[PDB]
Structure 1
């Protein structure tokens, strides 16, 4: 499947694409404002994510740090990123269908739009100014708005027991973006698309 990853933000992002134990395509690439990086994700990829990293430094080997979404210091992500990360999440060719979402379970750093570029299904977006509105106790000094699991490490916020309900904090994310996951047991905002659909993810889709 083809994912086109567009940076509409006014600032540079370092895009990332991983399934947790490996890269998807090259794993990470810088996107200046307006740039696009096109990737190929293997059919059948289950549990893939794309995200943006902010305020990154990399040496000539591709080693360094990012203030949000750092994946073990690598330009070319093998692993998931350090919260806070707005996540575009997808499992493809799962019994004939593709499943996509955006999640704020791991916080929010950059606004995003996740949309098919083929027919049969609708996109989802989390565009609101979550960083600007972020509860004081959730604010990430490095930038972004952490998830309460990250901050507070409780069974309730992190759904450790598979039993958890909404919280003031999940509800904050949910108010700003009702079409993204806010906690582990949120009513699902997963969209079913045709198997082998294609997609575009856009950072800062409105601004």
Structure 2
């Protein structure tokens, strides 16, 4: 499947793409304002994620640091990124269906739209100003709004027993972005698409 990754933000982002144990395509690239990066993702990819990283400095061998979403200091991500990161998540060709979602379970850094470019399902968006509205206790100094699990490390926020409810903090993410996962056991906002669909991820889809 092909994913077009579009930076509509007025600022530079460093896109990342990974399934957690391996890069997807090149795994990462600088995107200036307006740039598009087309990647190929092998069919049957399970647990793939796309995200943006902000305020990165890399040297000549693709080694450095980003203020949000850093994946162990690499330009080309092999691992998932450090919170806070708005996530586009996907599992492809799972019994003839593709499954896509946006998640705030690892916080929010950049607004995002995740839409098919082929027929037969709708897209999902989280475009509210979560950073501006972020509760003071979740505000990340680097920029971004952390999830409560990352900040507080309790069984309830992290749902480590497999039983957990919504919280004051999850409800904040949910009120601004009803179409994104706000906590681990949130009622799924997954969208089912035809197997082998194609997609666009757009950062800052509004402004």
User: Under a length normalisation based on structure 2, what TM-score does the superposition of the two structures give?
Assistant: 1.00
Q: State the alpha-carbon separation in 2 of the partners of residues 41 and 189 from structure 1.
A: 22
Tell me the C-alpha RMSD between the 2 structures. 0.2
Q: State the alpha-carbon separation in 2 of the partners of residues 119 and 170 from structure 1.
A: 32
Unaligned runs of 5+ in 1: none
Per-residue CA shift, 1:42-100, capped at 9, x if unaligned? 00000000000000000000000000000000000000000000000000000000000
Measure how far apart 1:114 and its partner are: 0.1
Measure how far apart 1:32 and its partner are: 0.1
1:132 aligns to what SS in structure 2?
helix
Q: State the alpha-carbon separation in 1 of the partners of residues 81 and 119 from structure 2.
A: 30
User: Under a length normalisation based on structure 1, what TM-score does the superposition of the two structures give?
Assistant: 1.00
Q: State the alpha-carbon separation in 2 of the partners of residues 178 and 113 from structure 1.
A: 13
Measure how far apart 1:204 and its partner are: 0.1
Q: State the alpha-carbon separation in 2 of the partners of residues 196 and 144 from structure 1.
A: 33
Q: State the alpha-carbon separation in 2 of the partners of residues 19 and 157 from structure 1.
A: 24
Measure how far apart 1:130 and its partner are: 0.1
* Alignment partner of 1:139 is 2:139: yes
1:156 aligns to what SS in structure 2?
helix
Q: State the alpha-carbon separation in 2 of the partners of residues 91 and 72 from structure 1.
A: 24
Correspondence for 2:80: 80
Measure how far apart 1:173 and its partner are: 0.1
Q: State the alpha-carbon separation in 2 of the partners of residues 44 and 82 from structure 1.
A: 25
Q: State the alpha-carbon separation in 2 of the partners of residues 166 and 172 from structure 1.
A: 10
Measure how far apart 1:35 and its partner are: 0.2
Correspondence for 2:68: 68
Measure how far apart 1:197 and its partner are: 0.3
What is the count of residue pairs matched by the alignment? 207
- Provide runs of 4+ in structure 1 moved above 3 Å: none
